[PDB]
Amino acid sequence: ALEEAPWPPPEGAFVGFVLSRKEPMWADLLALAAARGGRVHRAPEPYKALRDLKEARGLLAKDLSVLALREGLGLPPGDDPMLLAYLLDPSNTTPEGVARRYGGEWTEEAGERAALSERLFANLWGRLEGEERLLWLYREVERPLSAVLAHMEATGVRLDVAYLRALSLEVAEEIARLEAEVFRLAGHPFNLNSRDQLERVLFDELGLPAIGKTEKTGKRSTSAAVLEALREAHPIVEKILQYRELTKLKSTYIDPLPDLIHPRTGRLHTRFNQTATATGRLSSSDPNLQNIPVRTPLGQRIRRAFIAEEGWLLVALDYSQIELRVLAHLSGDENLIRVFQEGRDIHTETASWMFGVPREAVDPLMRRAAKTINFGVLYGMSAHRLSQELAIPYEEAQAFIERYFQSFPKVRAWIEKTLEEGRRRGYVETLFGRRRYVPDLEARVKSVREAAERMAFNMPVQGTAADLMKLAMVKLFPRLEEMGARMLLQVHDELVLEAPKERAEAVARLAKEVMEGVYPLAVPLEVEVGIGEDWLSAKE
DNA sequence: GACCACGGCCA
DNA sequence: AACAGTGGCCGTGGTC
Ligand SMILES: O=c1[nH]c(=O)n([C@H]2C[C@H](O)[C@@H](COP(=O)(O)OP(=O)(O)OP(=O)(O)O)O2)cc1-c1ccc[se]1
Numbered sequence: 001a002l003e004e005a006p007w008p009p010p011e012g013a014f015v016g017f018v019l020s021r022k023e024p025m026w027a028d029l030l031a032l033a034a035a036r037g038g039r040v041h042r043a044p045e046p047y048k049a050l051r052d053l054k055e056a057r058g059l060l061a062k063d064l065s066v067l068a069l070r071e072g073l074g075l076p077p078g079d080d081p082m083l084l085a086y087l088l089d090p091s092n093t094t095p096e097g098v099a100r101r102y103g104g105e106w107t108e109e110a111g112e113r114a115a116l117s118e119r120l121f122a123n124l125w126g127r128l129e130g131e132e133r134l135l136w137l138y139r140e141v142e143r144p145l146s147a148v149l150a151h152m153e154a155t156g157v158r159l160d161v162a163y164l165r166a167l168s169l170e171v172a173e174e175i176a177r178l179e180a181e182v183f184r185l186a187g188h189p190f191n192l193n194s195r196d197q198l199e200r201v202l203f204d205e206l207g208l209p210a211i212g213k214t215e216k217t218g219k220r221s222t223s224a225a226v227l228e229a230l231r232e233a234h235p236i237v238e239k240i241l242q243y244r245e246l247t248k249l250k251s252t253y254i255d256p257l258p259d260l261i262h263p264r265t266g267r268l269h270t271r272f273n274q275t276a277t278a279t280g281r282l283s284s285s286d287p288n289l290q291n292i293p294v295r296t297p298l299g300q301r302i303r304r305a306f307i308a309e310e311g312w313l314l315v316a317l318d319y320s321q322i323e324l325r326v327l328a329h330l331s332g333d334e335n336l337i338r339v340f341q342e343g344r345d346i347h348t349e350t351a352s353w354m355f356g357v358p359r360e361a362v363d364p365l366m367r368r369a370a371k372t373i374n375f376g377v378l379y380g381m382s383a384h385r386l387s388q389e390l391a392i393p394y395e396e397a398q399a400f401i402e403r404y405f406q407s408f409p410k411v412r413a414w415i416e417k418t419l420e421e422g423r424r425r426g427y428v429e430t431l432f433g434r435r436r437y438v439p440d441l442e443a444r445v446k447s448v449r450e451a452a453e454r455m456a457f458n459m460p461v462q463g464t465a466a467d468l469m470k471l472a473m474v475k476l477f478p479r480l481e482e483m484g485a486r487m488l489l490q491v492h493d494e495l496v497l498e499a500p501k502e503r504a505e506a507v508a509r510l511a512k513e514v515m516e517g518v519y520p521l522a523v524p525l526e527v528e529v530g531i532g533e534d535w536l537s538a539k540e
Numbered sequence: 541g542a543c544c545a546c547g548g549c550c551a
Numbered sequence: 552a553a554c555a556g557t558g559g560c561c562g563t564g565g566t567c
């Protein structure tokens with residue numbers, strides 16, 4: 001049905017490729033093809049014909065650009081129909097889904113994938129006509145950001161492997177101690193990693209009361225919430241909790257990561273999935289580097305393993321109270337804008353209230369616990385749950401919630417303005433125009449409607465925070481190449497850079513001004529910046 | 541071996 | 552466990 005003109009393909013053609021696995025850094029390029037005007041050009045040798053291309057254009061262009069960089073080839077990713085459909089509707093997350101929705105079939109052949117990329121682009125670009133606010137996000141944010149992400153995935157990050165190997169044995173012993181002590185209290189051994197077996201030990205053999213049930217099957221839950229309430233009911237809970245922390249950090253971080261070091265680059269390579277969340281945030285996978293531990297003392301020792309190359313330093317930049325500043329600009333609340341206009345720290349103030357210490361006596365562990373509460377209360381946590389997390393009576397948890405939103409009376413008016421427009425328009429949008437469709441705002445079941453409501457007014461705040469970060473990544477990346485610095489990781493409101501040790505302080509100051517002034521708001525955006533040889537030393 | 545659902549937990 | 556929201560990976564249990 002399509003003409004099979006031979007390689008080389010024309011210019012501005014749409015590419016179609018097949019990988020041996022989903023990870024472009026680890027994938028073997030199995031087939032390559034291009035399409036334009038109906039014609040489909042199939043590469044004889046994929047690695048040889050990959051050099052004939054001058055732009056990566058089509059579905060998942062970023063992934064092909066990452067494998068190209070893996071081969072020392074500069075093949076920038078261009079237009080991607082996935083970015084058009086993702087801006088039209090964040091529910092369009094995969095090539096299979098967008099194919100079933102807007103037309104065509106996602107197959108496993110490079111030629112058919114090439115032809116589908118051209119057909120999908122004309123359709124989605126036609127629908128995006130008129131949606132100029134979304135076209136601006138496409139032209140100015142999403143499309144150039146893929147090229148930035150391609151270099152981040154290709155560069156990778158250095159990992160102190162011998163440090164994690166020693167950390168594995170160091171924690172392996174501490175796990176055996178707790179494991180043996182939990183068997184002593186239970187009177188018999190069992191599999192502590194099996195929630196079903198722990199359920200019988202805690203709730204049938206012991207007289208411990210079951211606090212709640214699981215969702216799908218209705219079993220007696222052994223989650224950290226149930227156990228945290230049973231710390232005084234039995235000493236076995238105290239050691240089961242210490243056991244969960246270690247095995248989580250060992251089986252997910254300390255042990256898996258050193259085995260993912262790439263052979264050719266000697267670095268760890270993640271994937272930054274650009275069309276994966278409903279709010280416009282990025283997501284990381286294979287391995288996920290956006291959930292490296294940082295809270296517990298042992299978790300912070302895992303960030304020490306993320307190091308710069310010899311003669312380099314890591315530059316970390318983190319937005320301060322970012323979504324609270326976003327809410328101040330969206331709500332227009334005079335008292336909240338006044339807070340960031342006077343340099344006040346909401347997270348430090350909340351910790352000062354929990355621990356009965358002044359703002360000066362608050363430490364980072366206290367301030368991190370207050371962030372969990374400040375954003376929980378903001379996005380609709382119940383007064384009953386808040387009372388249990390803070391161990392305060394239900395009456396005090398109500399007053400804290402009312403005082404929270406009465407300190408900024410316009411934020412609740414803004415939540416209603418967003419909800420009201422949500423049910424009228426059928427979608428909420430960020431400050432830049434990125435939409436999320438939430439259709440259950442008029443559901444008749446109170447639980448389903450209220451769940452849709454909490455998702456509804458969260459997306460503008462979190463989505464605008466995501467957009468300001470993407471805009472900075474698009475503006476900051478070219479200024480780094482002219483300084484010999486690299487862009488490595490993005491953690492939602494945080495950028496991790498890598499610069500030579502002599503230019504590190506110059507890169508830290510430049511990135512600070514770019515991020516702070518990426519888009520001026522009614523409040524100033526303040527960025528905390530630190531330099532170190534490792535990730536933990538730079539976040540300080 | 542490959543794949544999945546579930547509870548559970550990290551940011 | 553809950554009227555916080557956004558993600559992704561783990562081991563267990565069970566199938567094909
Ligand atoms: O529980 C959390 N729910 C949540 O929605 N978010 C959002 C909102 C925040 O704006 C942004 C960056 O978070 P984060 O950079 O950590 O804090 P931020 O608000 O910028 O204050 P600062 O400490 O950076 O100055 O993620 C974060 C949460 C947590 C992070 C850490 C522990 Se719970």
Ligand SMILES: *P(=O)(O)OC[C@@H]1CC[C@H](n2ccc(N)nc2=O)O1
Binds near residue numbers: 294
């Ligand atoms: P981590 O270094 O403490 O957090 C880094 C990023 C910022 C927001 C995101 N996050 C963390 C924790 C929770 N509960 N929810 C989030 O969205 O991780």
